[PDB]
């Protein structure tokens, strides 16, 4: 058996805290090579409701949407937090998340 | 009295749980001020040769920023204080290494 290792663009389900909620969707930004070597990935958390916040990026589903919070970049231990794969975002969704991060940090 | 609010390039001392550590601020004052959050990368005193290290050179002591370990933190809630400021070239190298990881 080989462990699922997140690649860039994956939408994962990952525990964001042992003390409660114990999971949330996140969009992985870093590439497989890095994620596999380090056991870490850069990702942004997702929520279900959009508030019109400027750094929101809509994750568009067949019947229902989600929202990635592009300013809330997190470096996390995806292996230690039991990341599993929920799906994959569109190329343009990943691109927009990165473009918004770029607006914020030099 | 008014609170210190981090600007881009600031080296801050901030509680990292569960506690305090230095971090380099990457996001602009306006964002940090409006949100109470900032994007930063943690620092350590000892370089280990990790590929995403960026050496920070100071008057007395040195250390490294871990450029891959970008994180969004509640700086105001974690009691951030100012330790100093990184050189433009140091900030640029940190951003360059992030872009290698998370660039288009």
Q: For residues B57 and B88, is the Cβ–Cβ distance under 8 A?
A: no
Helix (H, G, I), strand (E, B) or coil at B102: helix
Largest CA distance in chain B: 43
C-alpha B75/C-alpha B8 separation (Å) is 13
Contact criterion met (CB < 8 Å) for B102 and A72:
no
Q: Residue for token digits 């090579």? A: A33
Beta bridge partners of B55: B64
Residues 6+ apart with CB under 8 A from B43: B11, B21, B22, B23, B24, B56, B63, B64, B65, B66
Report the run of H or E that residue A59 belongs to, with start and end: strand A56-60
Q: How far separated are the first and last CA of chain B, in Å rounded?
A: 43
Q: Which CATH number, 2.30.30.110, 1.20.1440.230, 2.120.10.70, 3.30.70.100, labels domain A1-106? A: 2.30.30.110
Please enumerate in sequence order all residues whose Cβ is within 8 A of that of A5, keeping only pairs 6 or more positions apart, or say none.
Answer: A32, A35, A36
Class of the domain covering B1-104: mainly beta
Q: Contacts of residue A96 in chain B, CB cutoff 8 Å? A: none
Strand A84-88 to A56-60 pairing: unpaired
Assess A101–B contact: CB distance below 8 Å, yes or no. Answer: yes
For A8, the closest chain B residue by CA position comes to B102
B101/A72 touch (CB, cutoff 8 Å), yes or no: no
> Where does residue A3 rank: exposed (0-12), middle (13-18), buried (19+ CB within 10 A)?
exposed
Q: Give the count of Cβ contacts less than 8 A between chain A and B.
A: 55
Nearest to A45 by CA among A78, A21, A71: A71
Residue whose token pair is 């997190």: A74
Is the omega angle on the peptide bond into residue B41 within 30 degrees of 0, that is, cis? no
Angle of CA points B93, B71, A83, to nearest 5°: 120
Contact check, Cβ <8 Å, B31/A71:
yes
Structural domain boundaries in chain B: 1-104
């Amino acid at each position: 058996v080989s462990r699922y290792v997140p690649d860039m663009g994956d939408l994962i389900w990952v525990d964001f805290d042992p003390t409660k909620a114990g999971h949330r969707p996140a969009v992985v930004l870093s590439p497989f090579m890095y994620n596999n070597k380090t056991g870490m990935c850069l990702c942004v958390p997702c929520t279900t409701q959009s508030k019109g916040y400027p750094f929101e990026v809509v994750l568009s589903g067949q019947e229902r949407d989600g929202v990635a919070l592009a300013d809330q970049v997190k470096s996390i231990a995806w292996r230690a937090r039991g990341a599993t794969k929920k799906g994959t975002v569109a190329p343009e969704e990943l691109q927009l998340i990165k473009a918004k991060i770029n607006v914020l940090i030099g």
